Each structure stands twice: as structure tokens, then as C-alpha cells.
Design a protein around this ligand. Structure first.
Ligand SMILES: Nc1ncnc2c1ncn2[C@@H]1O[C@H](COP(=O)(O)OP(=O)(O)O)[C@@H](O)[C@H]1O
Ligand SMILES: Nc1ncnc2c1ncn2[C@@H]1O[C@H](COP(=O)(O)OP(=O)(O)O)[C@@H](O)[C@H]1O
Ligand SMILES: *C1=CC(=O)N(c2ccc(N3C(=O)C=C(*)C3=O)cc2)C1=O
Ligand SMILES: *C1=CC(=O)N(c2ccc(N3C(=O)C=C(*)C3=O)cc2)C1=O
Ligand SMILES: [Mg+2]
Ligand SMILES: [Mg+2]
Ligand SMILES: [Mg+2]
Ligand SMILES: [Mg+2]
Lengths: 412, 11, 412, 11, 11, 11
């Protein structure tokens, strides 16, 4: 105190190394969006479970070849056929209907001509097959798509709609997944009012709590609103104890610089007995960013004490907090996606690695997107974080059009 | 992998 | 019937032209994620509302210049100071604290040396100012960040965390936004069982309902599960009437090809009296995709009758349905984001424009991502839809490494 | 704008 | 064709 | 340096 300046790269790997993976629970498959499977999932049935027509047409004997055929009836979707197709006969079929016994190929309706139908016009009676069917033509054999006993999803799979649909397909409606982190957010400062309050002398509204909670909720994680806590050790300790009790992760903002009434670091170390892994980061913005762990009865709580400056708080939440939460919910590689974009504007480099919210836009047919710093464009929310390199003797400035790293923080 | 932005290459 | 083949481009502009924008409602700002403002939002207060210190240090008179100063007390965060700084005096300040009357500049603590403190060591009494302060140095004047009467967010803004935080900052906790569409999904077919069912002869599990509902829920829209409807006109009409009653949008899958018991088009036209704008699309997959509107008492309902094939159903849901829903929830440009990627694999082109789910991956420092078709990669869900061009005399094949359009369908 | 994928240019 | 050097096209 | 033509590096 003052804590050493931690490199940005050391701070980041420290968060990922020291963050735990949460335990597992069984969920309903319909709740599986963004969850990570903690089990392999196996088909207990064949898909298709019967030989299925690929086409609307006729089930035939390929050995009959082309010619004129009696239609003995129809194989209807959802019904096992009871007839056997004999030589010179066929049965109508629709897409996904079972192939009746006696038939070994399907001929699509376009390769046929109807000869005779019922007086009512509701029943086909005789058809001309115009082609020589290949054996097994336009049939999905049993287990063509999925075999009984096949592993259809591996443990470690990060599920979206198509994985949910596969769980439905194989009838595995209950699955083991990692828990989502529960994340408690508090604001600190005697100067802060609720968003709902009219201003009073010397005061401003608390924006960080709203911004950070919304940032966590955007990624699908449950949250706990711990309110505004005054600049005093006892109150801060009480709020932190409530967060540890109710949540896996505690986010504070404010009170981490070396100011007179910046108390969070003292409380985390002396009162709470947490391990502070870093208390300053060589980065812009976010110098005072603080990361702590607290082990209670073989459970690791994680604490991010972010800076009070609203821009710092949201930038550091995106860099440190979101990857940690991804790790806790079981994502094997929790690192953010980093893309290449073109700077929309000349920018001066700082001795510190520098980060700024931006909007990524793809122009007509140019391969790389443009990054426009947020500091009609105002109709869209930030979807990137510009990652600017530390200045060097070589480079003191980057020019409009230069290719830069941008971390994805938004979902178009 | 680095969380720190790289300098532009071929430059 | 058979309906004309509609070009992919005509089908898409038809959906966007004929889809309505929903009406407005007032919401709590904390519920604003993904919503579009239907009002301009104005600051009623200055930010900062008092002259604020940028730094931990001292409020001084610049005209005093450097030298030794009596510290008359401290300006504390959240408290209006009651003292006037006179010549040869200063007052301690912290970041965000008000500047007391009499002071016109801030000198950061690093540009000072402490001369004398209290016996207890809890109180600074005299300090040496080592620098000549610039006038107004390290002070945020009233209204520096936001002025009273300023428009801080425009109508048409698509809100993320930072916009929510701005609403909090200015104390506008209730805002006019567009409604979200309510989306009803049904499956069709006598062959379909619930995901929870063991298989019976001739039957398969319904996967489309799960996949489509999950796809809609991923974008934040409320859904209604209309279940499995048999292949018969009366039941289909009853289900469609329930959907029209309970929802803004009805999605069906299955029963749109020219098969014997494919009845949806007849029911939509003759029974429901809906306007079918297209019933076939020249695209792969998704030939039978059907789009209809139904105007009841000056309300426009939209109906997507998607194909039964599970791959077709999810691909067409991503191409047609999601952009429509974006339009209905007030997004001014509802078109999906299209990026340039490199093909991971040689692919044969079809006469029809062709679409396939893929995974987008950025490699070390290569500017463009790779697109790997989904038809360790299995640990991640599809985040793109490959958009392959119709074949020509020139082009019958695309090669590994060629630059292709990929529509973003996932959020890293 | 087209919802149909383009052919590769400079080719 | 121009004997005068051009500027980078998209920038 | 090689007098033998190379293959495209990333492909
Ligand atoms: N909900 C669903 N889940 C899974 N497979 C389905 C579903 N609905 C239809 N299918 C299958 O898709 C195929 C086409 O179904 P069908 O109703 O004929 O679609 P369409 O007439 O639109 O082509 C059949 O094999 C059918 O069994
Ligand atoms: N919740 C918040 N919402 C908005 N502004 C805040 C919030 N918390 C702190 N700030 C402001 O950020 C600045 C820094 O606050 P401070 O508690 O000193 O942060 P730190 O000690 O981490 O630098 C001050 O101007 C403070 O008023
Ligand atoms: C367009 C305008 C411009 O100035 N510009 C540009 C591109 C690239 C660079 N580069 C460097 O300064 C160093 C490497 C490099 O590529 C400067 C300026 C445009 O592309
Ligand atoms: C890498 C391997 C490969 O075959 N390849 C490639 C690139 C580009 C093309 N192009 C065309 O066929 C037509 C235009 C074009 O760029 C073919 C093959 C690689 O980049
Ligand atoms: Mg504070
Ligand atoms: Mg401070
Ligand atoms: Mg069907
Ligand atoms: Mg059909």
C-alpha cells in the first residue's frame, strides 16, 4: 500500500488462474442456453428409427425397373405401414414416412406420371415409374443420422439453440451442467444518490451499479443488487459479508485509489482476511483495479474492487470480470474474442496499454471492419473495446486506417 | 495470447 | 399452389417491408437492455453539478503560486464545503469532491510535500505547493460532462449497459421504448412426439420447437409454446387462432411442401384469410418457406410457416424471422451483420444461393477469420451462417481460403 | 445490400 | 490512367 | 532465399 504496478498481462492471467470452476447441477434441457455440459450425452435411439423416405413419391422395387404400377396404398407420416410391396406394386410415401416391407427404393413424384385416380379424385390407383431407381435410392436407412449408443454431445460443449435441439432429438431432457455464478454489485461513496433521487448539494447519481449489473445480466448471469455503501470501514465490511453470503462473486466500484477515505483495500485485507493478488494495474483507464480471493470452508469467493470512475469501471468489468465469470460457468477457454479492425481516427499512444469502447462496422465489401471510438453512430451501443499498444520509441501515434486489436463486447 | 493490443505488423 | 419461386432478395425485402413496428410502452430503465428508445432523453441536471476535483490533492489560489500553505480543512466527497480559501491557504480535496469558494485550481498531492501534521497523525496542517497551477487546473467545471437541457440519448437508440448507465446518471428512470414481439411457435406432424416421450412405431421427437424457441429467446423476445399440431386442417386452424390471440408473431414448421398432407398454405389462405406473400423461395435449404400477414382491426399479425426439415427450419428462422423481430422491436436498421471470412473447405456451388451454419475463428494475427461449416470445434455453438453465391458458368466451386460473406448469428 | 452471398472480387 | 500518384482509396 | 516457388503461407 501503495501496491506494486502489475502488468496488464500478469493481472489478466492471475484472474483466470485463481478463479475457480463452479460445481455442477442437473437442469431441464430448455434452460441449457449458454450452459456448458458437464457430461457426455448419448443417443438411446436411432435417427431415423425406421427406414425413412427422403421424398414425396413412391416406394418401389428397383428390380421392377420402369413401367406401370398398381398403388396398393400410402405410408403416412407417424404410422407403421402394414402392407408388403410385391412386384409391379408401389406405395405412396411422403418425406419422413416409413418404407413399407417389400420396397427398397423411393422414386420422387417428378419421375412419375399418374395413370388413374378414384372417381372422387381423393385416391391414386396406378402410376407410371419413368426411371430405373438406384438400390436404396432416396431412403434414410435406420441410424443414418444418429446411431443408438453414439455420443452426440461431449462434456465441455457451450450450448446454443442447435445443441438444445439435439438434446430434444435424442430425448435427453435433463443434463448435468456447470452452475452460473451469482454476482453481487455494490457502489461506494458518501457522494452517491440512487438513480431515482433528485440531486442534493455535493452529490451525484450512482451510475456504475446500473452499468455493471446490466453488463453481467447481458451475459446471462444472475445478479444481487447490494446498493450504495458509505465511505466507512464498518459499513463496507457488513456489505462485503452480505455479498459473500449471497453470491459467488462480489463487484465493488470506488474507494480503491490512495485517497484519504479510499478504504476498500484495508477492509479486504485486515477485516475480511482476503488475499489481494493485485491492487494496481499498469493500464489506462483502471490504475487502481483490485482482485482478491477469499477461501471459506473449501469455497473460493472472488472479489473485484473496480475503480470509481464510470468509464474505468465498465472497461475493467469487460477486461477482468466477464472472462472470470466465463471460467466459473465452465467455459473451457474463457478468453474473449479479439478481432482485427481499422482505426477510424488518429490516436496518441500512452506508456500504458490503453482501452476504449468502440463500434465495429463492416463497410460494403471491405474485408476488415472499422472501429469508431465512442469517446447515427449514437443509435448503436458499443460492441468493441479498442486494445491500443503501449507507446515505444518507434510508435508514439497510430493513424486512421491502421489495423488494431478490438475485443468483442457486443452481440449484433 | 495477450490482452494487450499489438502494434501493426509489416510496418 | 404451386406458388412461384421467389428470389431470396425479393423474399427478404418483402419480409422487412411488410413487417410492422410495434407500439410503445413506458419501462423502468433497468429493463432497457436491447430496447430501442421511442423518446429523446434530456438531462435535467449538470454533470458535474458542482465544480469537481479531478485529483486527490489541494484546492489552491493559482495567484498564490508555489510556497508554503496553511491547510484550513478538507472538502469531503458528498459534502458542500463551508469555508472560503483565502490567500496562503488551501483545502485538501479528493477526486470528485467540490471545489470550495476562494480556490480556482487543484494541485495533485504528487506536486506537494507535507510540512506538518497533527500529533495523532490524523490531520494535515501545512503543505508546500511545488508548482505554479494553471488557472482552473484539474477542476471539472459545472456541466463539463453534461449540461442541463442537453439531449443525452436520441429516439431510435438501441440500448446496452452504457445507455442504461447514462439513464441512471441523469435520473431518467422511466422511458418510452418499443414493445418486444411476443412469438408463438408450433410444430406440425402426426409423426412427432414430445422430447420427453420414448419413441413409438413410426414416430420421432419434435426438435424444431425447442430449436426455434431457443433461437427467439437468445435474442431476448418473449415466447409461447403452442405444442405439436396434427396434420389436419381443423386442428391447424385452431392452433393458428390461439397464436393470433396470444402473440404478435406465429412460427410453424412442417407441412409447407407439396406433399399430400402438407395443409398449412390452404388453411392460411381459405380458413384464416391471411395474405401469403411468398410460398416458395429459390434458396438452399428452405424451398417451401412461407410468409403471411393477417390484418385484424388495424393490427398486423405476421406468420412464418417454415419447412419441417430441422436444418431448414433453423436456417430460415435466422434469415427471415430474426430480422423481422428486430424491426418489430423498433431497431431502425434491422438487417443482420455480414462479415468477410475465409472458407476452411472447398465447396460446390448450387444454382440456388446456399446457407450453412458455421463457426467463425480468428487465428493468431491473421486479419480475416476462418469459417468452418458445422456440416474441439464441437465445444462451440454455430456463430455464423455461410452465405454461398449461386453457381455461374465462371464459378461452379469455391476453394479453401476464398473470402465469403458470413451472417453473424452468435455472440462470443 | 444483399442477403445473397457475393462471389470473391479481384478474381 | 494518370501520371499523377493517387491517394490510398479507402481511408 | 529459394529459387523454388513457395506455396501460399496460410491456406
Ligand atoms: N418438429 C420437427 N422436428 C423434427 N423433425 C421434423 C419436425 N417437423 C418435421 N420434421 C421432419 O422434417 C421432414 C419434412 O417434414 P414436412 O412436414 O414434410 O416438411 P415440409 O412439408 O415443410 O417439407 C420430415 O422428415 C419430418 O418428419
Ligand atoms: N457509482 C458511481 N457512479 C458514478 N460516479 C462514481 C461512482 N463511484 C464513484 N464515482 C466517481 O468516480 C470518481 C472516483 O471515485 P473514487 O471512489 O475516488 O474512485 P477510486 O478511489 O477507485 O479512484 C469520483 O469522481 C466519484 O464521485
Ligand atoms: C490510410 C491513411 C493512413 O494514414 N493510413 C495509414 C496506413 C498504415 C500506416 N502505417 C503506419 O503508420 C505504420 C504501419 C502502417 O501500416 C499509416 C497510415 C491509411 O491506411
Ligand atoms: C489457399 C488455397 C487456395 O486454393 N486458395 C485460393 C485462394 C483464392 C482463390 N481464388 C479463386 O479461385 C478465385 C479467386 C480467388 O481468389 C482460389 C484458391 C488459397 O487462398
Ligand atoms: Mg469514492
Ligand atoms: Mg478515490
Ligand atoms: Mg409434416
Ligand atoms: Mg412435407
Amino acid at each position: 500500500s501503495p501496491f506494486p504496478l502489475t502488468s496488464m498481462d500478469k493481472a489478466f492471467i492471475t484472474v483466470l488462474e485463481m478463479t475457480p470452476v463452479l460445481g455442477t447441477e442437473i437442469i431441464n434441457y430448455r434452460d441449457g442456453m449458454g450452459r456448458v455440459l458437464a457430461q457426455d450425452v448419448y443417443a438411446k435411439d436411432n435417427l431415423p428409427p425406421f427406414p425413412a423416405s427422403v421424398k414425396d413419391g413412391y416406394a418401389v422395387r428397383a428390380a421392377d425397373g420402369p413401367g406401370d404400377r398398381f398403388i396398393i396404398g400410402e405410408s403416412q407420416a407417424g404410422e407403421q405401414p402394414t402392407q408388403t410391396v410385391m412386384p409391379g406394386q408401389v406405395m405412396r410415401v411422403t418425406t419422413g414416412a416409413p418404407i413399407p416391407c417389400g420396397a427398397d427404393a423411393v422414386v420422387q413424384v417428378e419421375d412419375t406420371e399418374l395413370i388413374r385416380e378414384s372417381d372422387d379424385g381423393t385416391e391414386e390407383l396406378e402410376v407410371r415409374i419413368l426411371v430405373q431407381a438406384r438400390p436404396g435410392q432416396d431412403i434414410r436407412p435406420i441410424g443414418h443420422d444418429i446411431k443408438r449408443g453414439e455420443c452426440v454431445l461431449a462434456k465441455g460443449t457451450h450450448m446454443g439453440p442447435s445443441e438444445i435441439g439435439l438434446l430434444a432429438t435424442v430425448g435427453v431432457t435433463e443434463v448435468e451442467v456447470n452452475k452460473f455464478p451469482v454476482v453481487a454489485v455494490m457502489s461506494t461513496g458518501n457522494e452517491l444518490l440512487n438513480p431515482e433521487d433528485d440531486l442534493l448539494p455535493g452529490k451525484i447519481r450512482d451510475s456504475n451499479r446500473s452499468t455493471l449489473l446490466a453488463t453481467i445480466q447481458e451475459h446471462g448471469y444472475p445478479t444481487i443488487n447490494l446498493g450504495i455503501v458509505g465511505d466507512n470501514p464498518d459499513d463496507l465490511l457488513n456489505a462485503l459479508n452480505e455479498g459473500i453470503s449471497r453470491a459467488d462473486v462480489i463487484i465493488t466500484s470506488g474507494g480503491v485509489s490512495m485517497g484519504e477515505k479510499d478504504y476498500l483495500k484495508q477492509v479486504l485485507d485486515i477485516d475480511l482476511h482476503a488475499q489481494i493478488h493485485f491492487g494496481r494495474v499498469f493500464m489506462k483507464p483502471g490504475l487502481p483495479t483490485t482482485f482478491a480471493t477469499l477461501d471459506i470452508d473449501g469455497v473460493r469467493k472472488i472479489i473485484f474492487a473496480l475503480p470509481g470512475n464510470p468509464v474505468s469501471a465498465v472497461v475493467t468489468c469487460n477486461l477482468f470480470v466477464v472472462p472470470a465469470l466465463r471460467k466459473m460457468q465452465g467455459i473451457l477457454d474463457p478468453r474473449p474474442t479479439i478481432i482485427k479492425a481499422r482505426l477510424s481516427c488518429d490516436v496518441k499512444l500512452d506508456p500504458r496499454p490503453e482501452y476504449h469502447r468502440c463500434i465495429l462496422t463492416w463497410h460494403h465489401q471491405e474485408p476488415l471492419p472499422w472501429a469508431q471510438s465512442t469517446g447515427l453512430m449514437s443509435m448503436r451501443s458499443a460492441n468493441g473495446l479498442l486494445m491500443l499498444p503501449p507507446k515505444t520509441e518507434q510508435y508514439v501515434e497510430l493513424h486512421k486506417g491502421e489495423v488494431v486489436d478490438v475485443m468483442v463486447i457486443g452481440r449484433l | 495470447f495477450s490482452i494487450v493490443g499489438s502494434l501493426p505488423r509489416d510496418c
